[PDB]
């Protein structure tokens, strides 16, 4: 029941400072423009210890499956090859991606009827708000 309140299908309803986050990450111009237009569906499900998070949009369809605390390979929507570890910290899913000596952290939290995603790269934060689909 670890992630019960995350499970479901969620639709992006607002984004703030995502272009600057993508710049900080190293995403190039054309990908930033097309990715920034996307209104993804995030689909979260749990089967035993395995959590699956899908992102579906006109830009890309991606999927990760993982066990909390257990590092995995991830190819991101912008085509980074990263090493990821996801943990639960006080009811927040904390997802750290490492690549090329760099690091970014994505936090996913339930707040009221929303799922709030905070993406941080150094000093730059983007906040993406999802509601139930
Ligand atoms: O919502 C997100 C998109 S847009 C979409 F989903 F359509 F791929 C793209 C990326 S990778 C990038 F930031 F480098 F661009 C995201 C990373 C973390 C959370 N959300 C993300």
**Experimental technique used to determine this entry:** X-ray
The structural domain count of the chain equals 1
- Of all atoms in ligand 1, which is nearest to the CA of residue 12? 1
Q: What count of other Cβ atoms lies within 10 Å of the Cβ of residue 53?
A: 19
Q: How far is the C-alpha of 40 from the C-alpha of 56, rounded, in Å? A: 5
Helix H or strand E encompassing 18:
helix 18-25
Mention every residue, 6+ apart, whose C-beta is less than 8 A from residue 5. Answer: 110
User: Counting beta carbons within 10 angstroms of the beta carbon of residue 121, is it exposed (0 to 12), middle (13 to 18) or buried (19 or more)?
Assistant: buried
Q: Which DSSP category does 6 fall into?
A: G
Q: How far is the C-alpha of 21 from the C-alpha of 89, rounded, in Å? A: 23
The torsion angle over the Cα atoms of residues 29, 26, 39 and 48, rounded to 10 degrees, is 160
CATH number, domain containing residue 18:
2.40.128.20
Q: What is the resolution of this structure in A?
A: 1.1
User: Counting beta carbons within 10 angstroms of the beta carbon of residue 125, is it exposed (0 to 12), middle (13 to 18) or buried (19 or more)?
Assistant: middle
Best of 15, 34, 35, 59 for a ligand 1 pocket test (most atoms within 8 Å of beta carbon): 35
Best of 26, 77, 125 for a ligand 1 pocket test (most atoms within 8 Å of beta carbon): 77
User: Is 130 among the annotated ligand-binding positions?
Assistant: yes
Question: Which residues face 103 on adjacent strands?
Answer: 98
Domain of residue 63 covers 4-129
Own/partner pairs for 65-73, CB < 8 Å, 24+ apart?
68/2
Question: Which residues face 21 on adjacent strands?
Answer: none
DSSP 30-56: HHHHHHHH---EEEEEEETTEEEEEEE
């Amino acid at each position: 029941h670890m992630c019960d309140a995350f499970v479901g299908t969620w639709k992006l309803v607002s984004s703030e400072n995502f272009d600057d986050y993508m710049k900080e990450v190293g995403v190039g111009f054309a990908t930033r423009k097309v990715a920034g237009m996307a209104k993804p569906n995030m689909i979260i499900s749990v089967n035993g210890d395995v959590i699956t998070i899908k992102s579906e949009s006109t830009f890309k369809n991606t999927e990760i499956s993982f066990i909390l605390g257990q590092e995995f390979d991830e190819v991101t929507a912008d085509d980074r090859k990263v090493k990821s570890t996801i943990t639960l910290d006080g009811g927040v899913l904390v997802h750290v991606q490492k690549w090329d000596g760099k690091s970014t952290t994505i936090k996913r939290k339930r707040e009221d009827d929303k799922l709030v995603v905070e993406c941080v790269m150094k000093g730059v934060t983007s906040t993406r708000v999802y509601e139930r689909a």
